[PDB]
RNA sequence: CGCUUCUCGGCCUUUUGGCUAAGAUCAAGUGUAGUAUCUGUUCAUCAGUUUAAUAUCUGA
RNA sequence: GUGCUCGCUUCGGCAGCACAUAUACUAAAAUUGGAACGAUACAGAGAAGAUUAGCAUGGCCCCUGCGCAAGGAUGACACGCAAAUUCGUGAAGCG
RNA sequence: AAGGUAUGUAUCAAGCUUACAAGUUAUGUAUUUACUGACCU
């Protein structure tokens, strides 16, 4: 009667969980514990059914989606996990975790233009900084001169952060990009803060042009100085500007 | 469906009042992860009403001012309903419109 | 190496749900002879008294 | 089948006219699933002491009732999920 | 008429249903609380 007691255990827990969901159809603890209880049976086509009718009652929670997808991804059913990630991200665009875990899943698989397509869809909704420079970090960790150039001019139109203006000045500090890196500095210098500078762009521009030679480095800190902020700088850096310009040149007597 | 006859008047006012304060706090709280520990604003509401009937002040410390003053406007609503029913069927059991015992023994307590 | 966010676990209010007029009311033991147990309470050297031995009195 | 017309020649034989398709087919069943009640034996009884009026909410639970009354033990059935606080792991990003 | 003699389970037929799909010991006391004797009209 081992079959009898086994099916008794299964039928009593199923009857318990079905009465628990039938009482409260809104708290979703019941569906996730019942569905992962059948996931503990390790061979199922019904825990899929439990989740896929558990989102009829509430599709707007992230927990059910990411738990059903990490269930389907925890097992070898990769096609189904991808096939529910795409409906998760088209149904709920603004939640970051679905995009992150679906990109991460395809990173652990091949780096196919599927993954880049997932990413550019994720770009298309105009997210925050956290996602965008994560995608440029993806393009750097596959060593893309071409594609990290491609996807990062569309960046700056939406985030004009000074922290991001100085890091569109990155082809200098990785490729040195001479003439068009100087054009990146032109793009840095003409935009917002024309007389007010946001007090930070030309610090890093002076750091690179001081890392460069005396090509045209005298101008921007001292002789393009019409654009001051009431003193041209705080007290914290102008003597540092002077000894910044002093001892890194031809040093003529 | 079933109407609200005179035996479930009082058991329907609470139902619709706590439905209204439920989907007022559901649409009033900002984007924090938990709403009310699944029920706790309602417990403060009923405690506020019990302290109203007993005239204890109910100064709960450390409560957010939008939820504490929505509890104040809902218990003033319920106290208006309660005392305006007390006036009404006290006058009815004065001139003798009703002989209901529940109403008489209840409006001695509500007065 | 450090910093912020996310997810899994080790976890420290969860009582049976809500509302009425706190929903409503209620709730008797003796006398006698003896013990046990808490709380309160306090604990300078002879001589004979006394005691199984010990511990009051008096003595300088 | 019928009735009518000699209508064509025997009352008889023939010709024409008028009339135009029923039935949950059964008296059965090899029949069929059988739930309610009653019996049998169990389980037994809302609200943090005891006796208790109730009125609700939920739906894959119904009964009585003409019910958009009301009553069926408040008709029954409704239970441990703590969350955020400490800490481990892992990820994403940055310096 | 209801409001009172509960309801909830487990086996056993007629009622009703189609007649079909079909191949730290200790004292003295104020002092409760427990306990004893088949104690007692
Ligand atoms: Mg009930
Ligand atoms: Mg009823």
């Amino acid at each position: 009667t081992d079959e009898e007691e086994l099916n008794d255990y299964k039928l009593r827990k199923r009857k318990t969980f079905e009465d628990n969901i039938r009482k409260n159809r809104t708290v979703i603890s019941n569906w996730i514990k019942y569905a992962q209880w059948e996931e503990s049976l390790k061979e199922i086509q019904r825990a899929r059914s439990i989740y896929e009718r558990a989102l009829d009652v509430d599709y707007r929670n992230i927990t059910l989606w990411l738990k059903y997808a990490e269930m389907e991804m925890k097992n070898r059913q990769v096609n189904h996990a991808r096939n529910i990630w795409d409906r998760a991200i088209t149904t709920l665009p603004r939640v970051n975790q679905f995009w992150y875990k679906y990109t991460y899943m395809e990173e652990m698989l091949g780096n196919v233009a599927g993954a880049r397509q997932v990413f550019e869809r994720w770009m298309e909704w105009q997210p925050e900084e956290q996602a965008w420079h994560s995608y440029i970090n993806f393009e750097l960790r596959y060593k893309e001169v071409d594609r990290a150039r491609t996807i990062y001019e569309r960046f700056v139109l939406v985030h004009p952060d000074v922290k991001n203006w100085i890091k569109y000045a990155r082809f200098e500090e990785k490729h040195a990009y001479f003439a068009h890196a100087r054009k990146v500095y032109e793009r840095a210098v003409e935009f917002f803060g024309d007389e007010h500078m946001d007090e930070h762009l030309y610090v890093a521009f002076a750091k690179f042009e001081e890392n460069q030679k005396e090509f045209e480095r005298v101008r921007v800190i001292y002789k393009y100085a019409l654009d001051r902020i009431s003193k041209q700088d705080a007290q914290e850096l102008f003597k540092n500007y002077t000894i910044f310009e002093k001892k890194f040149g031809d040093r003529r007597g | 469906a079933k109407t609200v006859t005179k035996q479930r008047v009082e058991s329907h006012f609470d139902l619709e009042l706590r439905a209204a304060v439920m989907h007022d706090i559901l649409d009033m709280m900002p984007e924090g992860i938990k709403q009310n520990k699944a029920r706790t604003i309602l417990q403060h509401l009923s405690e506020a009403w019990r302290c109203w009937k007993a005239n204890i002040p109910w100064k709960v410390p450390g409560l957010p001012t939008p939820i504490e003053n929505m509890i104040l406007r809902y218990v003033k609503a319920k106290a208006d309903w309660w005392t305006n029913t007390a006036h009404y069927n006290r006058e009815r059991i004065r001139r003798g419109a009703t002989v209901d015992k529940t109403v008489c023994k209840k409006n001695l307590g509500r007065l």
Side-chain angles (χ1 to χ4, degrees), chain B residues 21-35:
Chain B
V21 68
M22 174 65 78
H23 53 71
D24 197 354
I25 70 169
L26 190 145
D27 300 329
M28 189 187 69
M29 57 89 213
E31 286 82 3
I33 55 168
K34 64 185 70 62
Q35 290 74 236

Side-chain angles (χ1 to χ4, degrees), chain A residues 3-237:
Chain A
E3 289 179 351
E4 192 270 332
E5 288 177 352
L6 188 271
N7 294 121
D8 192 4
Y9 180 76
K10 287 182 177 178
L11 190 145
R12 286 186 292 113
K13 287 192 77 70
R14 284 189 175 98
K15 190 181 288 184
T16 302
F17 291 161
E18 286 290 329
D19 289 336
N20 289 321
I21 62 99
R22 190 171 67 85
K23 178 171 90 275
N24 296 115
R25 289 178 70 252
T26 59
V27 293
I28 47 95
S29 174
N30 302 114
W31 280 282
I32 59 171
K33 71 180 172 65
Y34 168 53
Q36 78 185 4
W37 184 77
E38 261 90 8
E39 193 271 334
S40 294
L41 295 180
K42 295 289 176 65
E43 293 299 324
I44 35 86
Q45 290 80 16
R46 69 173 68 194
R48 290 183 184 88
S49 180
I50 298 163
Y51 282 115
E52 198 171 3
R53 74 182 174 89
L55 54 91
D56 294 330
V57 302
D58 193 2
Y59 62 94
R60 285 173 179 261
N61 56 351
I62 49 94
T63 302
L64 189 143
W65 287 102
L66 63 91
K67 189 170 261 75
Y68 169 49
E70 286 179 350
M71 181 193 77
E72 201 75 22
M73 184 178 67
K74 184 178 185 290
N75 304 323
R76 300 292 186 271
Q77 299 301 112
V78 175
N79 194 3
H80 289 88
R82 182 182 297 170
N83 204 359
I84 68 173
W85 278 120
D86 51 355
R87 64 183 289 170
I89 63 180
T90 54
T91 298
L92 296 166
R94 293 294 185 180
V95 283
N96 307 321
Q97 288 75 242
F98 297 161
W99 295 101
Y100 287 169
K101 297 286 182 65
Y102 177 41
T103 54
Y104 185 82
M105 182 186 75
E106 195 66 30
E107 298 301 323
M108 297 301 167
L109 302 177
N111 57 353
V112 71
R116 188 174 298 159
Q117 201 277 334
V118 173
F119 268 112
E120 60 88 20
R121 281 188 280 167
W122 178 222
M123 304 302 102
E124 198 269 329
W125 291 92
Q126 313 302 321
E128 74 275 15
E129 180 67 33
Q130 175 65 256
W132 279 357
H133 71 286
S134 179
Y135 174 52
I136 79 100
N137 195 359
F138 163 70
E139 291 294 330
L140 264 63
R141 68 181 292 272
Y142 289 100
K143 296 180 177 68
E144 292 295 326
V145 176
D146 292 329
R147 289 176 176 88
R149 183 175 297 165
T150 302
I151 58 96
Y152 192 60
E153 189 175 3
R154 74 183 70 184
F155 177 85
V156 193
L157 277 70
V158 187
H159 279 85
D161 191 2
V162 176
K163 188 262 199 296
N164 292 321
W165 287 109
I166 66 168
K167 293 186 180 68
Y168 185 60
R170 66 167 303 277
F171 287 162
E172 291 82 355
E173 58 186 353
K174 192 63 179 177
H175 184 271
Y177 196 59
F178 181 72
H180 294 175
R182 183 65 175 86
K183 289 184 68 65
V184 169
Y185 284 143
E186 291 291 326
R187 295 181 59 84
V189 76
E190 90 243 14
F191 284 105
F192 185 76
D194 295 334
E195 294 289 328
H196 306 286
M197 292 183 169
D198 290 333
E199 68 264 11
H200 196 276
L201 279 71
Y202 302 144
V203 179
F205 174 64
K207 188 172 79 72
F208 182 73
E209 192 66 30
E210 180 268 332
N211 207 167
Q212 291 300 109
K213 303 183 290 292
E214 279 82 6
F215 182 76
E216 202 167 359
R217 65 184 291 270
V218 186
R219 303 291 190 272
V220 63
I221 63 169
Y222 288 161
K223 307 300 184 291
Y224 284 162
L226 284 80
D227 308 331
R228 65 184 175 95
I229 37 103
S230 183
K231 290 176 289 296
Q232 188 54 258
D233 197 0
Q235 196 182 6
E236 66 177 359
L237 199 62

